[PDB]
Design a protein around this ligand. Structure first.
Ligand code: FES
Ligand code: FES
Ligand code: FES
Ligand SMILES: [Fe+3]
Ligand SMILES: [Fe+3]
Lengths: 341, 332, 341
């Protein structure tokens, strides 16, 4: 498959890991993810060096992952620390590949490429997720589509007007204002819906509304497939700087060429201590992302064979600039690698 | 896959369609089938021109199918009639492919191939389905086998449907049409059929013919009559047995019964609307799907079928389909 | 796929066959297996010569297998003996392929390759299965892995230490002494676990014993994938021969390139008339082979694509000599055949 391996990808949410290993495939690479006794997260190739058994099916012994087949034990670095057979020798050939991993902003980031090049400073900024001023809730979802389809989906938040009709439709959609900002390793799609009636969702954020209001749906894309949106609503002429909002985490990580992992979240500055508001945001993520965006994109993935078999290319609309620019940047990154090594 | 695209195929029964689009694949082509406000059926490629979303998952807006993803709207011709974005321009690139479709004889016919060759006059004749003198009931069925296996099944020397349990032979070959005739004077095993028996009494003649039309549309004739009456004045049923390829290894099966007896009798409708009693008994379904699973082995090896005396009709039909395949493939 | 067709493989256990045909695929070849009225087992290609229907879905008529589609009937030799259509002629083109089959040692052996080379004298010896001095119980299992993975598994009974720890664990495993015997078309791995307490299984063998014991785990491999192990346990310094033992039948037969049939059994010389002793062996078989072993190897099979895509080769340990020798012999046999056609 075609992937951009030299970049950080989210492999899991902190709460998904423990002393019991989690087996998950990232960029066609099977991984064994677990948290060691000292709390440090480890990510090993889920293939024992001996006979290829799944290390993820083993248990921790003295904080070391024990292969369930013949008992070899490994440390977080992939180093074999115990061989219960024969002279118990541990030659270098018994070490397993260990991947660079960094736990930051309540996310487990992994570098699937040359471990020597992993640069922590290149990890996208999702600080809001651990900011005490924000309330964050979210989850995980699996989708049977190429990750680029979801990136396209998120880079044109205008699809909410239809796919999420019941919760996001606005009567001022025809008055939308959009801008695209290209930076270094970052692209932004700004959108503002002026003087309209709050959508059913924004209304909930406002705990009941009717009077006109201004709403924004901006989104920031960072190298490969990590996005953070900005959904905000505020009366008439109230600047978005001081508006209530939700900074949404929308990060995709390729599983196989035709499937991907979707990590989503909401970091809001309103109704912080409201379990009901928590419910509103969780219901939306469940219906919108997992049970609406999934259907559209999975159906699109099923039609790929037909479109490719024939010479069908997509027809872009005025709302596609951002998505197209991001698509082109990912394509360039793919070409570089396919061309580098 | 190998399909004969230049021909009319049944895509659905009238009752299956409404203002709520039906998504169905025909010859590996996904279609969005729906009936417009004026009652006219439309068939569009189920792939939005914008980003390929399934139009069949959308709803009608002002009689126009609205894509569920970003709202583009299309008319029955595939023409984009509304773009809610930006200047709302509608360049030709936003139109979606529309397929020739004709509703006739209580069937929805579609032409999946070269649209320039789509000629309504070439649509097989199933007039009995809408003939007030006949009572028609039927349904739809899905099978996991290549459509040719079911065509072979139906063309097989008068094996009839379970419900039809019971001069001589004659196989007339025409242009895109083949007829397999069978008259059974007096007969031995049994001439009067379980379902027809209730009619008349005195000695009779029996008939079991089937007509095949270009590709995979068949209409059979199951009948019985006393002494030696006219074939057309007999107690009979004309069965609709039409296959439409879905993928190379699966197909749609549209079946029906047009009978001239017990017209206003509901007991008979129920059994004639049964898939296993009228189209394929479970035992036979297990067999064609099992045959499809053995295709790889037979092809990998040089295994060819050994024909028996009962295969003439099936073989002739198979050869005609093969010729049609070659014609199309030859072009490109 | 790559198979060694010129050799005898077990296609079924005697008890699995009757007048009701069994459809099973061996080396990617679908077969119809059944026992005729006179008790003789027949194996026909499960593809009717007429239109390819599954003969295995038919019934016997006058001892002849009747195709469920149009009624052609065949004898054990594959010869069409009845055509109910037209003049009822039976040309040679209506005969179906019949495979060499031999019922011996309570096993149904079939020859899937060149029929002119099938030699009954080449059938592996599993006489213990029909020896009145032994009590035999066993069964069948289907596994989604290449048969070679299970051959590797069995040629290193040491995995029992971890994969079956709850029932096979042993402390003396560290003082293990193993031998490797090579013979004409035969390889044996010897294992001796002297001085120590018996595992949960051995204790049941000795009907709850309370004495340090000497254990024995040997296994014999014969051409391709037929194995017979020797699990024994006896009061310390006791003649290994005169020990309480169970000769285990462990025979694999490839189904497809990534799946296989597993025939297992236990021929014991202790507790012959004990339905409960029968119960301990049956429970172990259910938990250890069909469950535990299955899980490990099916996971390994799923990782084959990754290991092949990359240049990953297995790292052998001191416990792999036997398995490696057997693997090399099978590879040679594969090369020979591929070298001919
Ligand atoms: S496969 Fe892991 S120790 Fe053998
Ligand atoms: S995919 Fe249909 S309007 Fe976008
Ligand atoms: S397929 Fe076996 S008799 Fe016709
Ligand atoms: Fe969405
Ligand atoms: Fe085992």
């Amino acid at each position: 498959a075609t992937f951009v391996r030299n970049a950080w990808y989210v492999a899991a949410l902190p709460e998904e890991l423990s002393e019991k290993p989690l087996g998950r495939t990232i960029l066609d690479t099977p991984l064994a993810l677990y948290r060691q006794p000292d709390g440090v997260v480890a990510a090993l190739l889920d293939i024992c060096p001996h006979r290829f058994a799944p290390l993820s099916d083993g248990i921790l012994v003295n904080g070391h992952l024990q292969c369930p087949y013949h008992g070899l034990e490994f440390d977080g670095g992939g180093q074999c620390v115990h061989n219960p057979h024969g002279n118990g020798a541990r030659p270098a050939s018994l070490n397993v590949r260990s991947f660079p991993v960094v736990e930051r902003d309540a996310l487990i980031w992994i570098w699937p490429g040359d471990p020597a090049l992993a640069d922590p400073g290149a990890i996208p900024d999702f600080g809001c997720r651990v900011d005490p001023a924000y309330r964050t809730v979210g989850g995980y979802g699996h989708v049977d589509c190429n990750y680029k389809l979801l990136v396209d989906n998120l880079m044109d938040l205008g699809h909410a007007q239809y796919v999420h009709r019941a919760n996001a439709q606005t009567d001022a959609f025809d008055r939308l204002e959009r801008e695209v900002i290209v930076g270094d390793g970052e692209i932004q799609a700004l959108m503002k819906i002026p003087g309209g009636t709050p959508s059913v969702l924004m209304a909930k954020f406002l705990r009941g509304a009717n009077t006109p209001v201004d709403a924004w749906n901006d989104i920031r894309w960072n190298k490969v497939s990590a996005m953070l949106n900005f959904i905000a609503v505020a009366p008439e002429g109230t600047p978005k700087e001081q508006s209530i909002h939700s900074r949404g985490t929308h990060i995709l990580t390729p599983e196989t060429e035709a499937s991907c992992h979707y990590f989503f979240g909401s970091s809001r500055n309103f109704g912080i201590d409201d379990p009901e508001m928590d419910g509103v945001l969780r219901s939306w993520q469940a219906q919108a992302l997992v049970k609406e965006d999934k259907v559209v994109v999975e159906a699109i993935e099923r039609r790929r064979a037909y479109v490719e078999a024939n010479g069908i290319r997509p027809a872009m609309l005025s709302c596609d600039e951002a998505a197209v620019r991001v698509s082109r940047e990912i394509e360039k990154l793919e070409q570089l690698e396919a061309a580098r090594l």
